[PDB]
């Protein structure tokens with residue numbers, strides 16, 4: 208599809224057997240999801256943006272479906288105010304910017 | 307152009323007569339630039355990001371050119387980690403997400 212940017216580019220995703228709403232975010236290198244109790248091992252990480260840093264848990268090789276497009280990669284889980292789909296997964300679903 | 311996301315979508319912008327680099331950021335409602343001198347009156351504003359809230363200077367109706375495309379809109383100036391072009395200006399240059 209083609210998504211205009213009048214409003215936030217929010218889409219439904221499926222991760223860990225749950226459906227959630229997430230932003231298609233070209234400004235995020237990687238993907239950051241709201242606190243969830245995912246199974247498996249993880250590594251601690253600190254990620255910075257406007258306002259400072261938050262602490263997140265880094266999970267690898269996590270399967271995510273975005274608008275029916277499957278992808279698998281790194282997911283950072285922590286107290287983010289929004290679910291963020293970053294470039295590491297946007298490349299996998301074929302997402303481009305166009306103007 | 308069509309821009310892939312295997313690298314950060316960085317572009318050259320012109321604002322206040324100065325060339326800068328900025329990130330095309332679909333996850334940003336607003337455009338926020340690092341500290342700079344801008345010709346124009348301004349108003350104190352707050353904006354929130356992944357790590358909390360910061361104070362910014364809000365410049366309304368500012369001329370800004372993005373990868374050769376002209377926009378006139380609001381630009382926030384303050385301690386952002388990176389110059390970001392948000393949806394308020396992405397819509398002006400006709401930018402869409404496509405997959």
Ligand SMILES: CCC(CC)CN(C[C@@H](O)[C@H](Cc1ccccc1)NC(=O)O[C@H]1CO[C@H]2OCC[C@H]21)S(=O)(=O)c1ccc2c(c1)CC[C@@H]2O
Pocket residue numbers: 232234235236237238239254255256257288289291293331332333334335336337338353354355356357386387388390392
């Ligand atoms: C560094 C560039 C940029 C931040 C300037 C990176 N962000 C992504 C960017 O889209 C954020 C997304 C967002 C965060 C919170 C709430 C809503 C939307 N928008 C943003 O702050 O927007 C500002 C201006 O407009 C306003 O509307 C929305 C909020 C206000 S991030 O979220 O900080 C991030 C993500 C992953 C990762 C990192 C950092 C580091 C490692 C990891 O890869």
